[PDB]
């Protein structure tokens, strides 16, 4: 009977019965078997009504809870490995390589600073979420460079490469005790379905 | 555990603790001679002896291929290629190589009270047959190592018993 | 003694001593007991200083770590089950039903596309968080349809059903190398505590 | 041999070999040993390619998976404790103290309401993430008070203490079927690289 934890590799995710399972291969014991005979495994969810996909080639911990029976395995979580000469965590959190280089924008409040072994960094399927020790939170799109978040100093920046969209059915307020700056590279339109009021000290319209 | 990792034999007797390698023990010259059915011998004499032919009983437990996990190398194997696999924890190639070394018992004998018999001793054994035509028994090897010794004294007689074995 | 994992159901969350515990019932062994005699269980947190609430009726895995003693159970995580004819994951990630249908908005950069067994989908207490394989991130409010996130192509959209609020004590910059479009359905106000500058090529004020 | 789970305390995070490990001390068994002899432990990741930092002084569950060998421990997750007279969860989710008091802003759609044992609250390294039962999501910066999220009623608010930044290379649309309100405390600038159109019913420019 098999009682403890074991290291396995995910083989496939196409369940013929449809009960959201994945196929596994224990490293060392299930060696030499055809892929059509490997058993299907279930996983422990993190929350209620949440599903985290598995990709082929991942490393996991597998345990058999039903009286040590090898026909019904269970997946607990992901595993660390350093067989390739570097750990399998993103290089921003280890220091073994150069990671993501964001594009440079004029203005652009300072990007969050990243130090080794001190930040929460995740990178899967083209999305990167950063929560550093300074209190900064950022979500970025790797293929284009779209980012939402604030900085360790406490400044908001929402940067989009491509079109952006802000709308709200109802009252909208835009306030800035500073200067407020509006700039367009093409043509600007200000349309209203009623009255318009421009209230300032002095107004200048230049060429 | 140190003995297993180094591949040696341990026993603490007469004020010493002993670590002796198994590979060098196979090439050691004998020091005493024990003979049976020979009354003109210059050595000592065996009065009773037992022949054990069960070599599988002790080799059954050591017929495995060791494997272990190392964070920088992956999975590390050692041993034969046609044996079942068994997992351990220490991923040290030198420790893995010596995991399956031991001494195989072959013979038990009872002699007339020799107090120089201690474990680690190598003896030369010659056994003659007592019927038919005085043929030598080839099933007992020439050189053997002492594994266990028991000395016993009653109010009339002093006797010793020993267990002999061969390095795998 | 009980050593392995077991399947249980959450009964109640009102701890008489206040040490943040929950009441459990193991399926099969604790059958026939009154609810006032069931033991209180503790849970493994995911991070430091985080609390995930439990609702009555959930399925979990329970293990007893203190020498197999049944008086002090421990909750590990949620469990999968398909007793009702479909798995207990959201239907967008399985394909066994029709899920959330967002309202249609004019403009509205394309909603993230969802495929079966390839996306991270969570739905609890009226909040849905989606992280698809294309790199899109979206957070939505189920009862009204408020959403923040970007798209697999890399476009930002922040849509609110009801009032919206954007403010910042300090300098504010709004830039768009495209056209910049401002439109109101009621009355528009532009107020400043100083000078105002309108700098373009040509200006048109129409009816 | 050691087979079950055990309670330990994190000692250090500076791995001399660089394979992202942490040093642990089991409570009760490893008492009296110098800090230079304690073994280094690995952890189970939550997702693929994600790293969650550990700080000295945390409480965890530790298990030895390699044939019960104490030289190679494994960290499973965080643990609950109430040795100080109150549980180790944030006080907003328990009710044993007064928690975070956000600053008051004029306007400012209502802050999410928090009830005991009914909300997801996390607070680590100066960042607080709230997901309440009403369907509200909020991320806040503790040292300054910067916040992104919406409300249980479904209203968007992005508040920054300090500068803020909104930009997008491409077409930008700002729409509000309500009134749209723009207000500045200093000087306001409206610059365009082309034509400008003001289209309303009537226009008023006042002092």
């Amino acid at each position: 009977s098999l009682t403890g934890k074991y290291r396995a590799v995910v083989i496939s995710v196409d369940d013929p019965k449809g009960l959201m399972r994945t196929q596994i291969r224990v490293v060392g014991m299930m060696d030499g078997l055809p892929d059509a005979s490997l058993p299907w495994a279930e996983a422990i969810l993190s929350n209620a009504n949440t599903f985290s996909p598995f990709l082929p080639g991942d490393k996991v911990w597998v345990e058999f809870p039903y009286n040590g029976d090898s026909r019904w395995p269970l997946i607990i979580g992901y595993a660390q490995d350093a067989s390739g000469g570097a750990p399998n965590v993103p290089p921003e959190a280890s220091g073994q390589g150069e990671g993501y280089v964001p594009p440079e924008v004029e203005g652009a409040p300072a990007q969050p600073s990243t130090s080794a072994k001190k930040d929460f960094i995740s990178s899967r399927n083209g999305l990167m979420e950063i929560r550093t020790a300074g209190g900064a939170w950022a979500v970025t799109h790797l293929k284009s460079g779209t980012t939402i978040g604030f900085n360790e100093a406490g400044e908001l920046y929402a940067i989009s490469q491509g079109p952006a969209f802000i709308s709200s059915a109802g009252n909208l307020d835009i306030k800035s005790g500073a200067d407020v700056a509006l700039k367009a590279g093409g043509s600007m339109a200000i349309e209203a379905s009623g009255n318009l009021s421009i209230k300032a000290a002095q107004v200048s319209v230049d060429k | 555990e140190i003995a297993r990792d180094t591949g040696s034999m341990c026993w603490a007797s007469r004020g010493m603790i002993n670590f002796k390698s198994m590979e060098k023990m196979a090439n050691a010259a004998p020091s005493l001679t024990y003979e049976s059915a020979n009354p003109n011998t210059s050595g000592f004499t065996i009065s009773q002896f037992n022949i054990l032919n069960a070599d599988y009983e002790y080799q059954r437990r050591h017929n495995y291929r060791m494997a272990s996990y190392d964070m920088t190398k992956g999975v590390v194997y050692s041993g034969n290629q046609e044996d079942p696999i068994k997992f351990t924890s220490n991923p040290d190639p030198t420790a893995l190589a010596n995991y399956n070394k031991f001494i195989l018992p072959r013979l038990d004998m009872l002699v007339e009270g020799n107090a120089a018999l201690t474990p680690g001793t190598t003896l030369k054994i010659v056994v003659h047959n007592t019927a038919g035509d005085g043929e030598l028994d080839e099933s007992i090897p020439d050189k053997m190592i002492v594994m266990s010794v028991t000395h016993f004294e009653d109010r009339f007689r002093f006797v010793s018993r020993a267990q002999l074995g061969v390095v795998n």
Side-chain angles (χ1 to χ4, degrees), chain A, chain B:
Chain A
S1 45
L2 307 167
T3 56
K5 316 225 190 274
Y6 303 99
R7 273 186 198 236
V9 181
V10 173
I11 296 275
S12 162
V13 292
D14 303 359
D15 192 5
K17 274 172 171 273
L19 315 165
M20 291 315 258
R21 305 181 293 207
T22 52
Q23 200 171 16
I24 64 166
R25 168 185 257 140
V26 182
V27 177
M29 313 216 176
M30 301 191 178
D31 263 333
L33 281 162
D35 285 8
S37 303
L38 297 175
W40 296 90
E42 74 204 6
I44 293 187
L45 327 176
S46 45
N47 264 344
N49 242 11
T50 174
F51 177 68
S52 301
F54 289 100
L55 297 171
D58 290 320
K59 306 200 171 331
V60 282
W61 291 92
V62 172
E63 140 180 54
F64 311 99
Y66 297 108
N67 286 325
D69 217 344
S70 47
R71 286 176 283 197
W72 296 276
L74 174 79
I75 299 173
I76 299 177
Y78 288 103
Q80 292 181 351
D81 195 7
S83 270
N88 57 342
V89 279
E92 290 95 359
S94 65
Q96 316 262 348
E98 176 188 359
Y100 180 70
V101 187
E104 298 163 356
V105 187
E106 145 172 55
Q111 219 69 13
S113 96
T114 294
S115 62
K117 291 161 285 160
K118 260 162 278 294
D119 297 333
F120 175 85
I121 299 167
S122 155
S123 196
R124 184 141 160 111
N125 288 332
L127 183 82
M128 160 159 297
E129 171 196 340
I130 299 170
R131 302 149 60 104
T132 182
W137 176 79
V139 172
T140 205
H141 188 75
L142 291 172
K143 200 190 70 165
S144 75
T146 310
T147 279
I148 295 186
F150 42 87
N151 170 30
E152 294 130 326
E155 323 148 279
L156 272 186
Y157 59 101
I159 282 157
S160 164
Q161 320 272 19
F165 189 78
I166 295 180
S167 159
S168 86
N171 269 308
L172 176 85
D173 304 342
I174 300 176
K175 282 158 9 152
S176 166
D179 310 301
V180 176
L182 188 56
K183 163 169 210 141
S187 75
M188 169 171 302
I190 302 168
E191 295 179 357
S193 194
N195 319 53
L196 180 81
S197 168
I198 300 174
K199 211 168 181 172
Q202 81 187 184
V203 183
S204 291
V205 182
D206 292 29
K207 201 177 183 178
Chain B
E1 190 179 359
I2 288 175
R4 198 179 53 203
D5 293 349
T6 51
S8 47
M9 179 196 176
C10 296
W11 70 101
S13 87
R14 302 162 200 250
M16 315 204 31
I17 186 173
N18 295 319
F19 296 101
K20 297 274 186 197
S21 174
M22 294 263 198
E23 61 154 31
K24 304 193 181 164
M25 260 178 138
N27 286 327
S31 54
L32 301 165
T33 300
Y34 276 120
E35 305 192 5
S36 161
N38 200 345
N40 269 339
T41 180
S42 40
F44 309 108
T45 298
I46 308 171
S47 54
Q48 304 179 357
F49 73 101
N50 258 266
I51 293 184
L52 322 173
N53 220 350
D55 309 341
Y56 186 69
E57 190 165 9
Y58 316 111
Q59 284 185 357
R60 193 177 67 174
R61 314 151 201 200
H62 293 99
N63 282 333
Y64 280 116
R65 188 185 160 186
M66 301 295 128
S68 82
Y69 181 75
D70 192 2
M71 218 144 172
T72 45
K73 274 125 88 175
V75 178
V76 178
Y77 298 108
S78 147
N80 331 290
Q81 263 304 110
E82 71 295 19
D83 281 346
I85 202 173
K86 182 171 170 172
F87 275 112
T88 51
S89 64
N90 195 352
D92 198 4
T94 305
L96 280 172
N98 297 324
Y99 200 79
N100 283 321
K101 288 201 209 151
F102 64 105
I103 292 186
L104 196 75
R106 286 274 194 94
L107 189 91
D108 293 350
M109 58 168 217
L110 192 82
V111 290
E112 323 167 21
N114 192 344
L117 277 166
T118 82
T121 322
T122 308
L123 328 166
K124 174 185 169 176
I125 299 184
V126 176
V127 176
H128 293 271
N129 188 5
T130 179
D133 282 358
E135 296 246 341
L136 213 77
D137 279 22
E138 304 274 339
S139 41
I140 299 163
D142 199 6
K143 328 199 292 184
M144 314 209 85
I145 307 169
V146 184
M147 307 167 65
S148 171
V149 184
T150 294
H151 308 276
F152 169 88
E153 151 142 24
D154 73 0
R155 35 204 281 258
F156 301 117
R157 169 98 169 178
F158 171 51
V159 190
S160 305
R161 179 173 192 219
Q163 183 172 11
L164 302 162
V166 181
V167 184
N168 236 5

